[PDB]
Design a protein around this ligand. Structure first.
Ligand SMILES: [Br-]
Lengths: 211, 211
């Protein structure tokens, strides 16, 4: 996505909370930014546009912009704000409206939990079949929204990544998976591979290497 | 909602489907309508603005509008067209972007595919940390509904099992993962552990062993 939003932004009731939306000079750096809110699967509604507060929305919501990063601040987080928030703007470089991935804003009803990250190399059984897959297990995190990035050696992998939608497990925390399909030629040629998981203020990165 | 959309619409592969967006004179009747596609609660993409086709969106998407009702027509439904579609415009009585409730498009008759199962033994990084985790990667299956059962040697295992709800990946197929938490001594005390995946009455099972 041309616009980058954080995965999860949470806090207790009455807490000052801030979302961000990062792009480039051809979208956020020169065009107004709108923020839309969607609860469950209900109808989305505009809650901020061009740093201007729409009629009917409370003034706890405030929008600002500095360079290529727009922000939505919620001064006094309340339970009725628990929703997904999407930012969007016009992208003159592509001549189309452009929308970010969305941020899940959660009112904490349970302790915030950073995720456990376990990186699995390709088993010898799979490589004996001329196949290679790496799995990055993301477990026991709340709220259920994370950002995953992969690195070949120390350079990012810009293709081949598949990350599952977080799902709630039996302990009421969330779990997800991110797998990367390779060939035996790449797994041996590279010195290491990395999976990086971002959950609010916590970022965990695991690294594995061929035997 | 100020904009009215049908809740859900279905159609087989190759059918022509038309979604409608109903509004007012101060919003739909006066201003261009944009259509936005959201998948797997992923980043949404605009598929039609002002009845004109953006770049990269195939020709099968066409837009029309007459009076206070705008329409998006999708000829030749494909698996990747299956999504939620939202329409939005500018309202003039109010001064806001307004969004409809969305239309869930379900593409029928998509090809079936058995899941590819990959069972990962506990990594060396976590065995040295006195941990043990088996991960059963399930991918490339349609439809998106599996049932996972584990085995220690030949005995069923339930305690320590968590399975992710399937989610659609970039190939329009589903992916999930089930993980079993063990201690390092359970892991070597047994001959093997197994992960059985059942999809559409047919079973795929994998088996791993220590070191
Ligand atoms: Br702005």
């Amino acid at each position: 996505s041309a616009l980058t939003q954080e995965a999860s932004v949470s806090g207790t009731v009455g807490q000052k909370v801030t979302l961000s939306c990062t792009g480039n000079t051809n979208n956020i750096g020169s065009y107004p930014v709108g923020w839309y809110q969607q609860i469950s699967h209900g109808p989305p509604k505009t809650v901020m546009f061009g740093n201007s507060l729409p009629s009917g929305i409370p003034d706890r919501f405030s929008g600002s912009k500095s360079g290529t990063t727009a922000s939505l601040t919620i001064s006094g987080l309340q339970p009725e704000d628990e929703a997904d928030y999407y930012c969007s703007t016009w992208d003159s470089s592509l001549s189309v409206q452009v929308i970010g991935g969305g941020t899940k804003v959660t009112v904490l009803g349970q302790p915030k939990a950073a995720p456990s990250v376990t990186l699995f190399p390709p088993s010898s059984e799979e490589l004996q079949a001329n196949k290679a897959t790496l799995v990055c297990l993301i477990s026991d995190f709340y709220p259920g929204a994370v950002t995953v990035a992969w690195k070949a050696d120390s350079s990012p992998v810009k293709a081949g990544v598949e990350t599952t939608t977080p799902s709630k497990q039996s302990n009421n925390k969330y779990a997800a998976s991110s797998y990367l399909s390779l060939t035996p030629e790449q797994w041996k040629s590279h010195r290491s591979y990395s999976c990086q998981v971002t959950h609010e203020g916590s970022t965990v990165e695991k690294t594995v290497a061929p035997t």
